[PDB]
Amino acid sequence: MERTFLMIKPDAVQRNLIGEVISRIERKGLKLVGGKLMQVPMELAETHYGEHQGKPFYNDLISFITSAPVFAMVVEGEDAVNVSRHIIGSTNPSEASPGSIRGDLGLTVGRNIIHGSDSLESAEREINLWFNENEITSYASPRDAWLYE
Amino acid sequence: MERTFLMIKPDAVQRNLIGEVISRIERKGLKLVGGKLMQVPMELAETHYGEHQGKPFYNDLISFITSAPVFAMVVEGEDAVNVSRHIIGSTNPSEASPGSIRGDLGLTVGRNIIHGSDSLESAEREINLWFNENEITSYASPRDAWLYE
Amino acid sequence: MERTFLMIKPDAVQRNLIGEVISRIERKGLKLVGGKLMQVPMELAETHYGEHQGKPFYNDLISFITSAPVFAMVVEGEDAVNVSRHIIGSTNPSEASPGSIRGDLGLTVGRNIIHGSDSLESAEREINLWFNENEITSYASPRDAWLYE
Numbered sequence: 001m002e003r004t005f006l007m008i009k010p011d012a013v014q015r016n017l018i019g020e021v022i023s024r025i026e027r028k029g030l031k032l033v034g035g036k037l038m039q040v041p042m043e044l045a046e047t048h049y050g051e052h053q054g055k056p057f058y059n060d061l062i063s064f065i066t067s068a069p070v071f072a073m074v075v076e077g078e079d080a081v082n083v084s085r086h087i088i089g090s091t092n093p094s095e096a097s098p099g100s101i102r103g104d105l106g107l108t109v110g111r112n113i114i115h116g117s118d119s120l121e122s123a124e125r126e127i128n129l130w131f132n133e134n135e136i137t138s139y140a141s142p143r144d145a146w147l148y149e
Numbered sequence: 150m151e152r153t154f155l156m157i158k159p160d161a162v163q164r165n166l167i168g169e170v171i172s173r174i175e176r177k178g179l180k181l182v183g184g185k186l187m188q189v190p191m192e193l194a195e196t197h198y199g200e201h202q203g204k205p206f207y208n209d210l211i212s213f214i215t216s217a218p219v220f221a222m223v224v225e226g227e228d229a230v231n232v233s234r235h236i237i238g239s240t241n242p243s244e245a246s247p248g249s250i251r252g253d254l255g256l257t258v259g260r261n262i263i264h265g266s267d268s269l270e271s272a273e274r275e276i277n278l279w280f281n282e283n284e285i286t287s288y289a290s291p292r293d294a295w296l297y298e
Numbered sequence: 299m300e301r302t303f304l305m306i307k308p309d310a311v312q313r314n315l316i317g318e319v320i321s322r323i324e325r326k327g328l329k330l331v332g333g334k335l336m337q338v339p340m341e342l343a344e345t346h347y348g349e350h351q352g353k354p355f356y357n358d359l360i361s362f363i364t365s366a367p368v369f370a371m372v373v374e375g376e377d378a379v380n381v382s383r384h385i386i387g388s389t390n391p392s393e394a395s396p397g398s399i400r401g402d403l404g405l406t407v408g409r410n411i412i413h414g415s416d417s418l419e420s421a422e423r424e425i426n427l428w429f430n431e432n433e434i435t436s437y438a439s440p441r442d443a444w445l446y447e
């Protein structure tokens with residue numbers, strides 16, 4: 001089944017919102033298949049956020065993401081990449097739909113709760129960057145027969 | 150006052166979200182006026198969803214809706230039909246607004262949690278199809294003085 | 299730091315939705331810095347809602363806002379006026395996004411749960427009108443370093 005990379009950022013961690021973010025992912029029908037609380041080393045931060053090296057927020061992003069643990073996830077489900085982006089909401093929490101993770105819990109664009117892969121291509125890159133395959137489980141669940149034709 | 154027919158589908162029943170969906174309806178201010186847990190007969194499913202007869206998903210539609218019990222409901226309030234459609238959200242859960250029942254809880258279009266009548270006339274037909282009048286109660290909520298001018 | 303005036307209306311008070319409304323404000327990141335349960339004198343209502351004096355709904359507005367107590371608040375945070383309106387949703391709960399306070403909890407345009415100031419000008423006006431400076435507390439919170447760069 002399709003997989004994406006999700007990551008609860010240090011603002012949500014330091015706000016004691018880990019369970020609440022997870023609940024939103026779970027209740028959507030997405031399956032957690034990889035999951036670890038970890039500190040992000042500088043090298044990992046930078047390769048993760050490589051595409052943004054040009055920009056004025058870059059230094060502040062790298063600092064932020066490396067300032068306290070994140071909860072990194074691999075998440076499975078039909079159309080999982082676009083589904084997750086949909087529930088996460090716009091990069092800017094003031095544009096994100098109410099009801100979305102960022103919309104409900106994020107205040108500013110730079111501190112916006114959670115990351116999700118932006119495409120299949122960047123899902124497979126990020127999943128490989130953050131996880132080894134031995135860290136990723138595969139398992140059938142009761143509700144699987146009810147989520148899918 | 151205006152009434153609509155809502156039905157918590159088998160996916161939400163088998164995922165144990167009955168209470169959660171009812172709560173979404175109740176806090177919107179809609180009044181539950183009829184409700185029963187029931188298995189859907191083949192004949193009722195087919196007449197209820199007859200407008201979809203030769204669409205590719207129809208056989209799946211009919212097998213799903215008959216596969217386990219549903220929670221059938223008559224709900225009352227000003228503009229109940231549209232108000233209900235609005236908190237249910239789009240047919241496809243990944244189009245449905247975050248914060249809507251389908252946006253938050255459904256994963257795929259085939260398994261989208263809850264049904265609501267799509268028009269005033271389809272509400273009266275579906276209400277009549279699913280309930281006899283002696284199944285529909287009549288009562289004043291203390292809250293009404295405050296939902297309306 | 300930018301601040302705005304939010305007011306939980308007698309309909310949410312009379313449906314016992316006070317904590318639930320306050321929770322959506324808090325979890326967005328907004329900091330409650332002033333707050334008080336109070337009956338609204340007629341003159342306070344009239345000056346707060348003076349703009350609408352001509353309109354056909356004005357008399358209903360005044361009677362409604364004075365029918366039971368309200369919860370008056372001053373809330374603080376970056377872009378607080380717009381951020382507040384965003385989570386609150388459109389005046390009409392039927393056009394407000396699912397997931398917003400008005401979309402999930404309101405039923406009609408006149409019984410729509412909460413007020414927020416509509417610009418920086420009206421924020422300062424409403425805060426001054428409803429509160430004295432000595433009822434508005436100023437304080438560092440733990441989360442602050444995680445909401446903002």
Ligand SMILES: Nc1ncnc2c1ncn2[C@@H]1O[C@H](COP(=O)(O)OP(=O)(O)O)[C@@H](O)[C@H]1O
Pocket residue numbers: 052057061090091109110111112115116118
């Ligand atoms: N204008 C900005 N100011 C500060 N930080 C930003 C800005 N734009 C993006 N960021 C940070 O960079 C992260 C990645 O940006 P981008 O990849 O465009 O969005 P997304 O995280 O939604 O995929 C954002 O989630 C955010 O934390």
Ligand SMILES: Nc1ncnc2c1ncn2[C@@H]1O[C@H](COP(=O)(O)OP(=O)(O)O)[C@@H](O)[C@H]1O
Pocket residue numbers: 201206210239240258259260261264265267
């Ligand atoms: N493209 C599709 N693939 C699978 N199932 C579908 C599809 N379109 C509709 N359905 C199913 O048929 C039901 C009724 O369809 P429709 O009347 O168009 O939507 P709604 O239920 O939003 O009014 C939907 O609730 C869904 O269960």
Ligand SMILES: Nc1ncnc2c1ncn2[C@@H]1O[C@H](COP(=O)(O)OP(=O)(O)O)[C@@H](O)[C@H]1O
Pocket residue numbers: 350355359388389407408409410413414416
């Ligand atoms: N057509 C209407 N009918 C009844 N009440 C209305 C109407 N329009 C506005 N109101 C009431 O007056 C309040 C103030 O109106 P307005 O400033 O237009 O909206 P908002 O409160 O979203 O800033 C609304 O929250 C609502 O309680």
Ligand SMILES: [Mg+2]
Pocket residue numbers: 118
């Ligand atoms: Mg991106």
Ligand SMILES: [Mg+2]
Pocket residue numbers: 267
């Ligand atoms: Mg339809």
Ligand SMILES: [Mg+2]
Pocket residue numbers: 416
């Ligand atoms: Mg206004």
